[PDB]
């Protein structure tokens, strides 16, 4: 078969790709008891089984075998436009039950508030466990991944596209339950199935609680005595310890690190990390604690997150290193950074050769002696063939981040953590929790703990994009945050109270009391 | 072995990017009696065959694999940086003979005009024919080609880079012989060699003649009268002809089609396209015909090359179609196209979706109904199963190229072509040439028939990129341009004479005969 054969051979390569390039899988093999050989060999034979097979469907089957890896910077995406679509937005409480957040549609027979109880007779929590992945090990992380896939189903992300009317179960506030028929928004698909035209083929001849929001889903702390609204959302309220006394706290949500992308972001005014310069400023003089949400955070730029940092503490912050897979790719470019450091004496001789700027971060002196370690020891590595799991590098050889060298503040900080944050809102936490800077709170995040690098490569199974992770981060006192990811200070989950009606009261509340003790006893958050 | 195995993976690989993505193959088993199932077992073999291969030794394997389509698109490189220098330049007139004709180091016996009879006691010839490829068939554009590198060799590029001193049988200008014994300027490979590290890699345990430049190298062609001083080599010049009769001809020079790799190009200030439009108005007012050098040119952005022609016309000039091949992403692409100016009907609509001009067309109505068409032309050959070689269609659905609304020079001219023109440099004379706009002087043009794109994908062997060709452009009368390339109206080689002393004059001469020809008839008499 056509499709057979193409599949096959795209199937191979993906695995080829897995033993040059996926730095995560010896960590994989142990924590999960994942094979890569039990992987292919499955299926190869789901490929080979079927009869006359078409498109999709082996992409189906690729899109499972990168899946089988359970991780968030590992997946795969297709040339496909095919979807399904409910415009319900659900959201698990901590006692289990699934609340309606967000209906972004004007029909009105379920609303805000309501309780999801089935899905086409069948109960959530069932319809859930056939969107989970080969090796689910029903962490929160994984429970939200898939709830995210609930209502959405995508072509593009190897998904089996359902259609027509469905069934779904809701209980109404008051204790009454009711039973909505409702159709998903379902786009065909627009790209031909090769399977359907490979017959025809002759031979050649010539001649929001969306990931990502800007504002977040998290309502104002208190009276607001201040605000930005510039590019980030930002602001100053009060608060009240049970004392009667009354305390200048501030509000700032990183909605990601992938700057480029932020909502309404102008590439032609002045880079956010500018921006997030003068709201610290605003807060260095005009508040007494800082509150940071970073829930919901896809992460992004290394060099991005390193800077919003170094800008957040008047000392430096011991950051983790990288266990590196090698190939002389990674090789030219420490090269390259020898080459290009080479005659590098003074901090103004790093300016002129760095740009004196990395998405924020201060091009330093130490900043070209970072960079130039890094690398040697790159080059160290693939000389003594340590090259399938390097011993732990620093990215960019930054061994540590050093303050920004005009604003930076100094006073406490609480970080609110979630399911939903991943790579570099991983680290965020991390860095302000090894080098206890930072009060986190909230619940463990997702743990997607190495960098991402994507392949592009020509192919007829309309495969798009395959992204793999290609290093180990590895936490100081030697955790690994893959899978694990970081587990905040106080365990704080969102009650049904606070998702219900969607006012956080608890949530917020324990926040507050939670700050305004680190006001008070400055930071040292006993009780 | 590892290299070994590595090698055939990649190599495997490359084989199926021939299948699935390389346009012209039908037309290289045809014209080169080539053959891929045949061309892969031999390297196959080449590398099983060899005891302990090294990196190096496998990139030339799959550098001669690549070498064999004979197509200047279709090429690899590397991740190595062991290069052999020689500042030294040749350069073959038309006798047949090879002439020296430039020197880039200290005073040196090599004199400017000096023959070339051996290096290191083998004619140059011989020399130069183990720099051709598994399918050379001796033109022009080869053997340019091959001259390029026999005093530069990279192991970027796939070549055995020699090293110490050689001697280079030189022939004075007058008759007399010498050789002097040089030294190659070497760089020795920074990225380790995978064989000689496979051993210690233990598994991972857990926990100028420049082509493209500027200024190009024929001299001036008389007494400059008006020159520009922007990024662009033009001026203006007056030209007696065989009656005392004298004309103001005009010059400029189009190095390379990639306007943002020009020599000097200032990424902030205007783009390159707006300097020819004041270039030519000027031109327009103050010249009788123009001179269009040409020679090597690297080719660029098709766009680009659109909007340079579409200021050197009063009328529509027609465009060669391309054969592609399919894969899915291409038809996401025709969808793409048909999203995005699904409800354009104006020209201020059109402007408003794809821009005031694309690379300096300018976009009208027309544009988007091209763009339109070149939609649902590609889902018409998807769904019809012609993906292998489809049916000829035009880039972007421009079937013709539509007069600038501004700027449009109608008085005679004439290009200027040799041997080291490719893809758009290609283009630019043929449309020019099929049309009837212009003269088209100098020698048959490389033989770039197709567009390119690049493949990249981690692997051991040290891969950086494949290039390779996904189309085979056809002119109005069927032929091809791939090899075969474009024929001058007027064969003008560059004669011993010529080049002996850098003087051309012998070649200018001729061209101002043909210039002035040209001023003395409304002729272009389209019959």
Redesign the interface.
């Given at each position: 078969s056509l499709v057979c054969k193409?599949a096959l051979?795209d199937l191979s390569?993906l695995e080829?790709?897995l033993q040059?390039?996926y730095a995560p899988?010896?960590?994989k093999e142990?924590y999960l008891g994942w094979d890569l050989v039990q992987s292919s060999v499955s299926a190869q034979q789901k490929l080979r089984t079927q009869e006359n097979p078409s498109?999709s469907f082996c992409q189906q089957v690729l899109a499972d075998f990168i899946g089988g890896l359970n991780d968030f910077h590992a997946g795969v995406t297709?040339?496909?436009?095919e979807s399904a679509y409910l415009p319900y937005t659900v959201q698990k409480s901590s006692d289990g039950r699934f609340y309606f957040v967000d209906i972004m549609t004007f029909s009105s027979e379920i609303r805000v508030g309501d309780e999801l109880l089935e899905v086409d007779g069948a109960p959530v929590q069932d319809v859930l466990a056939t969107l989970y992945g080969s090796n689910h090990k029903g962490t929160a992380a994984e429970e939200s991944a898939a709830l995210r896939t609930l209502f959405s189903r995508m072509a593009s992300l190897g998904h089996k596209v359902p259609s027509g009317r469905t069934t779904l179960k809701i209980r109404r506030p008051f204790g009454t339950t009711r039973e909505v028929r409702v159709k998903w928004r379902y786009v065909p698909e627009?790209?031909?199935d090769?399977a359907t035209?490979?017959?025809?083929?002759?031979?050649?001849?010539?001649?929001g609680y969306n990931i990502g929001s800007t504002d977040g889903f998290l309502p104002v702390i208190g009276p607001v005595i201040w605000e930005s609204e510039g590019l980030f959302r930002a602001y100053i309220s009060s608060v009240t310890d049970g004392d009667g006394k009354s305390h200048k706290v501030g509000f700032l949500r990183i909605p990601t690190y992938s700057w480029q992308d932020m909502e309404d972001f102008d590439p032609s005014g002045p880079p956010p990390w500018e921006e997030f310069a003068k709201i610290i400023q605003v807060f260095s003089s005009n508040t007494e604690a800082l509150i940071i949400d970073q829930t919901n955070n896809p992460g992004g730029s290394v060099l991005y997150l390193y800077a919003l940092l170094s800008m957040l503490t008047d000392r430096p912050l011991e950051l983790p290193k990288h266990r590196m897979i090698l190939?002389?790719?990674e090789?030219?470019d420490a090269?390259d950074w020898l080459t290009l450091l080479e005659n590098v004496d003074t901090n103004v001789e790093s300016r002129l050769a760095l740009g004196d700027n990395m998405e924020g971060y201060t091009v330093d002196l130490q900043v070209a002696e970072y960079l130039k370690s890094f690398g040697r020891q790159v080059?160290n590595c693939?000389?003594?063939?340590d090259?399938?799991?390097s011993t732990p590098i620093p990215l960019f050889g930054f061994e540590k981040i050093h303050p920004h060298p005009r604003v930076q503040y100094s006073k406490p900080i609480c970080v609110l953590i979630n399911e939903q944050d991943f790579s570099c809102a991983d680290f965020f936490p991390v860095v302000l929790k090894d080098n206890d800077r930072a009060l986190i709170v909230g619940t463990r995040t997702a743990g997607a703990g190495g960098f991402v690098?994507n392949?592009?490569?020509?192919?007829?199974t309309?495969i798009?994009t395959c992204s793999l992770t290609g290093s180990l981060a590895v936490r100081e006192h030697?955790a690994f945050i893959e899978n694990i990811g970081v587990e905040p200070h106080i365990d704080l989950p969102f009650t049904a109270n606070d998702i219900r009606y969607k006012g956080y009261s608890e949530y917020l509340d324990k926040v507050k009391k939670l700050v305004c003790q680190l006001i008070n006893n400055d930071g040292t958050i006993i009780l």
């Amino acid at each position: 078969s056509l499709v057979c054969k193409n599949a096959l051979q795209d199937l191979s390569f993906l695995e080829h790709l897995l033993q040059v390039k996926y730095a995560p899988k010896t960590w994989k093999e142990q924590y999960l008891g994942w094979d890569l050989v039990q992987s292919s060999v499955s299926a190869q034979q789901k490929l080979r089984t079927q009869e006359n097979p078409s498109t999709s469907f082996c992409q189906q089957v690729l899109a499972d075998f990168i899946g089988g890896l359970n991780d968030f910077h590992a997946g795969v995406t297709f040339f496909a436009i095919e979807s399904a679509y409910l415009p319900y937005t659900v959201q698990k409480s901590s006692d289990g039950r699934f609340y309606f957040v967000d209906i972004m549609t004007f029909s009105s027979e379920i609303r805000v508030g309501d309780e999801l109880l089935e899905v086409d007779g069948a109960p959530v929590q069932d319809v859930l466990a056939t969107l989970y992945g080969s090796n689910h090990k029903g962490t929160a992380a994984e429970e939200s991944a898939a709830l995210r896939t609930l209502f959405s189903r995508m072509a593009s992300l190897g998904h089996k596209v359902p259609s027509g009317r469905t069934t779904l179960k809701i209980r109404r506030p008051f204790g009454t339950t009711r039973e909505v028929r409702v159709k998903w928004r379902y786009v065909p698909e627009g790209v031909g199935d090769l399977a359907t035209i490979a017959p025809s083929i002759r031979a050649p001849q010539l001649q929001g609680y969306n990931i990502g929001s800007t504002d977040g889903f998290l309502p104002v702390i208190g009276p607001v005595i201040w605000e930005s609204e510039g590019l980030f959302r930002a602001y100053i309220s009060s608060v009240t310890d049970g004392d009667g006394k009354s305390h200048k706290v501030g509000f700032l949500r990183i909605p990601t690190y992938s700057w480029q992308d932020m909502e309404d972001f102008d590439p032609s005014g002045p880079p956010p990390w500018e921006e997030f310069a003068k709201i610290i400023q605003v807060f260095s003089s005009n508040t007494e604690a800082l509150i940071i949400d970073q829930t919901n955070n896809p992460g992004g730029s290394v060099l991005y997150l390193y800077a919003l940092l170094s800008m957040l503490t008047d000392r430096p912050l011991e950051l983790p290193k990288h266990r590196m897979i090698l190939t002389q790719d990674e090789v030219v470019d420490a090269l390259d950074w020898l080459t290009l450091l080479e005659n590098v004496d003074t901090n103004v001789e790093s300016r002129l050769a760095l740009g004196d700027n990395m998405e924020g971060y201060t091009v330093d002196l130490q900043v070209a002696e970072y960079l130039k370690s890094f690398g040697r020891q790159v080059l160290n590595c693939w000389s003594k063939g340590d090259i399938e799991l390097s011993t732990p590098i620093p990215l960019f050889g930054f061994e540590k981040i050093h303050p920004h060298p005009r604003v930076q503040y100094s006073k406490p900080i609480c970080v609110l953590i979630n399911e939903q944050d991943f790579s570099c809102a991983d680290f965020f936490p991390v860095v302000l929790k090894d080098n206890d800077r930072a009060l986190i709170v909230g619940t463990r995040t997702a743990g997607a703990g190495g960098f991402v690098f994507n392949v592009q490569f020509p192919n007829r199974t309309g495969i798009k994009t395959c992204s793999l992770t290609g290093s180990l981060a590895v936490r100081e006192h030697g955790a690994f945050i893959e899978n694990i990811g970081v587990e905040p200070h106080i365990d704080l989950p969102f009650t049904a109270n606070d998702i219900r009606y969607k006012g956080y009261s608890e949530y917020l509340d324990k926040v507050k009391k939670l700050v305004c003790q680190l006001i008070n006893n400055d930071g040292t958050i006993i009780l």
